């Protein structure tokens, strides 16, 4: 133990720091400083104001006696000669403990619970540990929420990151929060909130769940509301992240963090990037966000060191009822699957609106079968995903001017989607599905077609379970 | 004879009349909104290229 | 000599006191050695672009360079081992850092040192005047990697002073001794080569022999051959792991090479300790494949230049292990990443796209990615021959139109399989777009077809026009209903109705349809076309297609169970099989036709 | 807090207004061709939504807590409306059973009296709560006893034409002067609900 200890003491010394003068210039988030000497690179820099306020920045290029910073707390009232800069030598560092559990830190990072500091037993970084691929396993023991139409058709295990599509006005978060508030194994989640420009009465909502479930010992919370400062928001996520990631590997917790609206973050992204010239990418974009979501979304799941888990549920907003659009798109590549909300289905009163044509899951086959499930939950699922599409098709002929062009399998899929919708799918905000009994409605449902035109299905499951 | 074959003419007829003018014309108008959304974007994707 | 940082702007890093530098070579820039590679120079300004994340760098640091552009060692170990676009090794870092990380800034020889190889000498003896690429003796390694040939890198000749008797060693020490003009020519048990220029070979050589992929709707339709080019769609659970499972265990080259570039870690690991329980399907089932496996995997967190050159290490391992006379295959991960990357580094660095966002040498760069792939002479004194085959991974996006990196990669790539939207809503799968897919190899290895399978060309080309006639007429019958249908018609929506649960449909997990030999193929093929022939002439003569259908009844069960055949239960065994199917069938109809 | 926009664009996406959506709690689509038609207030009932009747509930109940139970049935009213308009722009009318014509012409009776702040007047400029809150409870009323008495047996085209002035009597219920000292008002809603209830009592067999 005695290699933390003297790691620590070394450590232990003070280091004289500078300061500098002369901001040759500025221009919107970014300060222009030129009388720099050996600028070092990723480092925070504290700024006094002429009102004697003390702000921070990080800078971002250097040059030969020239560099540029941004400010996270807005540029507003500065003086050329009036205000004076700091340099700390070091990348945005980070304190730990084991005891921020039931605390609340603002969008930098600092405890808002009116109590103290964190006093941390160690330091970190922000973007360290490009972990090992090698060591990294994949996720088993298929994960519970509650939830039929999350956890049959789209069933996803302990470890896997994956987002939720979202637009205008739906009923995104206290889906999650109902998800986070009943999930459990199939057979005790630590819980990593981060808030990035959402309304206040979001946050509101989202404490009284916590608390009221009793589950806010459990879990910490970064909170950054729409009416602070944009440039805080391309922190928070690293220091949930940091944080989640301490959590589960050297505090060996199962751990589950919900980033909150990456719209905002990556908005801003593209905001403080015009602010420099740069060459944008499609609909004025900076042309690298690739890069930065990976780094985002790359920490998950767990490894071969010990029992800490890690699971992420970013929440997307459409901006137009579209995936084309770039953020969506981009995220398509980097996550396992998507799960989807419809405009329409929310129009029709459906709760969740979950649409599933679109949404998917990138893996069920270690989460699926039995020793954990029932094995017939495959074929379930792919004869109930192709009939919904075959009544959809069929709904669609019948526009033309109607039955013109119509077949029994028509009438068939179309009571088969309507009472599937409205019975299935339509799941109340505490109405417990236990994957045995989502699988019973699943197969009442399937007693609706004759023994043939069930082709997705293996004989003995039919045989099996077609009647009891 | 006389009687199916009324009934089926009227249908037929019906039919055609309505397709040919209640469905065309939607077509028609989407199709040329499309045009000019992409339009647009072409330009102003020109415009920041030459900025 | 040495230079100093002068200015950071993320992985782009600008540089001064740099003259005399070459357009391509490594400088282990910063205080730590980081790698970097030049890109731009003007005066003695240089930019260098880091393969490793910069962080808590400053201007006035050593600049030291190395006078050799971005290179790869080549030798024995290369079998059985996982690297990253730098070639750097993983079980050895991972276990010898003690940590869960790569280290910042490492370095450590890509093939294991301190390994003993057994050397076999050649026929070469001291005087003999030899040049590069000539088999000087050969190493074993294992089953299958045995007689791993000892080659002399090319550009390389002399004439043999001394060679080292038979025995072990270890691929740090010349045992071979030679002379152009001085004792300047050691060649230890590895050489090297720089990853850009493209391995000169003999001379090229077309191809034949066509490619087993188990899957007879292409293996059927839409063949490949050794040594040629291919496009894969994939969608990540549209069976394509499955299938690269299916030939790496079928493959009938050696050796196979797939690469990681945006892999998502989870599939990484996933795939990475699936293969240590997959089987070689030669001598037996052996338990191993690694000795006939080569994989290296780049992540999306890994920064954009090791993912930029993931692919070129890859294309060259290709080459080499093809120097060595043997058949080998390459599968790609996805191009999309490597075209993204591309125009990441082309934006960053500072240009004008005009694609649609992307630099125009997307089209020059895939084409000479695309010209490393063939059958040619193997280099050397045994006058020997190799193949590279290779199969690139798409991601179909975008809306309805746009998809330009499809669009410069077909201009030049003849085998494309298309990619079906509605099979996939069904979950049927393989889900492949028959009319859009399409090849070229199906004129050369009409040779093959000649040889084994005569009849095969116009029996597959019926098949196919029956198939087309039928999705012509069905979107008709859809806006009008079923009228006016002659018997003909619905035989054709039948049988084609069967071909497509019969062919078209195939699990890897199923005992069957893992895998399809040619000749099985071959057999349900003969027995489809004979139903649907014999369907026509039943009705040609006139009938009632109805109760000729209900007479034929079991048959229709009988030829979709054909698939229920284990594959080579004895391979005239299930031949004779069809042939009892075939009679009886024939029986069954020339009862029905009167 | 309210604000206008003014999309001229080629669209009604444009980035002004999906900025503005995505922080806003209500919405309040409008269309053009009412303005044509004269309709006021020229809203789209089809795209527009609110966030604050979740909680509004708590106050209903402590006045009004019948009140939020209606305006879901309110609002399907509309919707089985333009889901039906489908077939009659296809094939016309004629296919559609009594209850379908029901649902039609209660639709459009919405929509020309309790859908029309026209003109300027007691009636024409403001409406209380209570006011509202008797109409929706009219209006349903009157569409449940159409829809039970046809159902109960009753050819919907004889019912109709003999029912009558019902129809102008609960139209022209909006013509009261609100803020009559809200007992008249409320006595006059009281009797022309007990007046429209018997009739279909004697009509509704």
Known sequence: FAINKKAVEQGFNVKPRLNYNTVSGVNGPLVILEKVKFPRYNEIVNLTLPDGTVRQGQVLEIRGDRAIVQVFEGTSGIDVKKTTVEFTGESLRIPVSEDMLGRIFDGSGRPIDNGPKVFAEDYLDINGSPINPYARIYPEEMISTGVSAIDTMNSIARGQKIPIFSASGLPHNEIAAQICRQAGLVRNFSIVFAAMGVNLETARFFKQDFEENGSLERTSLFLNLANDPTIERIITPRLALTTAEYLAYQTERHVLTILTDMSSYADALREVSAAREEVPGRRGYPGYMYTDLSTIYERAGRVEGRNGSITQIPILTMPNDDITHPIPDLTGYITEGQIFVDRQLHNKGIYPPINVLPSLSRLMKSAIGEGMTRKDHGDVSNQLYAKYAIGKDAAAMKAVVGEEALSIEDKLSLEFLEKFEKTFITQGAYEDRTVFESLDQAWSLLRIYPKEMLNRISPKILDEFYDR | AFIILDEVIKVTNRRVNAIEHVIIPRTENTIAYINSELDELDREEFYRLKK | ?594
């Open chain 3, 1 to 594: 000599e040495y230079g100093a940082i002068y200015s950071v702007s993320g992985p782009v890093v600008i540089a001064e006191n740099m003259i005399g530098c070459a357009m391509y070579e490594l400088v282990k820039v910063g205080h730590d050695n980081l790698v970097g590679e030049v890109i731009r120079i003007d005066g003695d300004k240089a930019t260098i672009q880091v393969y490793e994340e910069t962080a808590g760098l400053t201007v006035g640091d050593p600049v030291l360079r190395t006078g050799k552009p971005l290179s790869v060692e080549l030798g024995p170990g290369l079998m059985e081992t996982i690297y990253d676009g730098i070639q750097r090794p993983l079980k050895a870092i991972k276990e010898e850092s003690q940590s869960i990380y790569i280290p910042r800034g490492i370095d450590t020889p890509a093939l294991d040192r301190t390994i003993k190889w057994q050397f076999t000498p050649g026929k070469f003896q001291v005087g003999d005047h030899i040049s590069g690429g000539d088999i000087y003796g050969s190493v074993f390694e294992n089953s299958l990697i045995s007689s791993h040939k000892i080659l002399l890198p090319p550009r390389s000749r002399g004439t043999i002073t001394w060679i080292a008797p038979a025995g072990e060693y270890t691929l740090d020490e010349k045992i071979l001794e030679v002379e152009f003009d001085g004792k300047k020519s050691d060649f230890t048990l590895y050489h090297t080569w720089p990853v850009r220029v493209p391995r000169p070979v003999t001379e090229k050589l077309s191809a034949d022999y066509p490619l087993l992929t188990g899957q007879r709707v292409l293996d059927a339709l839409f063949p490949c051959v050794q040594g040629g080019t291919t496009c894969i769609p994939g969608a990540f659970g549209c069976g394509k792991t499955v299938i690269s499972q299916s030939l790496s265990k079928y493959s009938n080259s050696d050796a196979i090479i797939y690469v990681g570039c945006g892999e998502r870690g989870n599939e990484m690991a996933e795939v990475l300790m699936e293969f240590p329980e997959l089987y070689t399907e030669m001598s037996g089932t052996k338990e191993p494949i690694m000795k006939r496996t080569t994989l290296v995997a780049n992540t999306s967190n890994m920064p954009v230049a090791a993912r930029e050159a993931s692919i070129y290490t890859g294309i060259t391992l290709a080459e080499y292990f093809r120097d060595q006379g043997k058949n080998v295959s390459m599968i790609a991960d996805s191009s999309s990443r490597w075209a993204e990357a591309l125009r990441e580094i082309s934006g960053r660095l500072g240009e004008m796209p005009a694609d649609q966002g992307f630099p125009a040498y997307l089209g020059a760069k895939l084409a000479s990615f695309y010209e490393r792939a063939g059958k040619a002479v193997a280099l050397g004194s045994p006058d020997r021959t190799g193949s590279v085959s290779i199969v690139a991974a798409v991601s179909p996006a975008g809306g309805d139109f746009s998809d330009p990196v499809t669009t410069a990669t077909l201009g030049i790539t003849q085998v494309f399989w298309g990619l079906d939207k509605k099979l996939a809503q069904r979950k049927h799968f393989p889900s492949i777009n028959t009319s859009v897919s399409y090849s070229k190899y199906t004129n050369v290895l009409n040779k093959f077809y000649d040889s084994n399978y005569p009849e095969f060309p116009v029996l597959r080309d019926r098949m196919k026009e029956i198939l087309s006639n039928a999705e012509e007429l069905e979107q008709v019958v859809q806006l009008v209903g079923k009228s006016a249908l002659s018997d003909s018609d619905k035989i054709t929506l039948d049988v084609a109705t069967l071909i497509k649960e019969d062919f078209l449909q195939q699990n890897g997990y199923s005992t069957y349809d893992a895998f399809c030999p040619i000749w099985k193929t071959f057999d349900m093929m003969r027995a489809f076309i004979s139903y649907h022939d014999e369907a026509q002439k039943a009705v040609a003569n006139g009938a009632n297609w109805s109760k000729l259908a209900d007479s034929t009844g079991d048959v229709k069960h009988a030829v979709s169970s054909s698939k229920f055949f284990e594959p080579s239960r004895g391979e005239k065994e299930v031949h004779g099989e069809f042939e009892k199917l075939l009679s009886t069938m024939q029986e069954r109809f020339a009862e029905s036709t009167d």
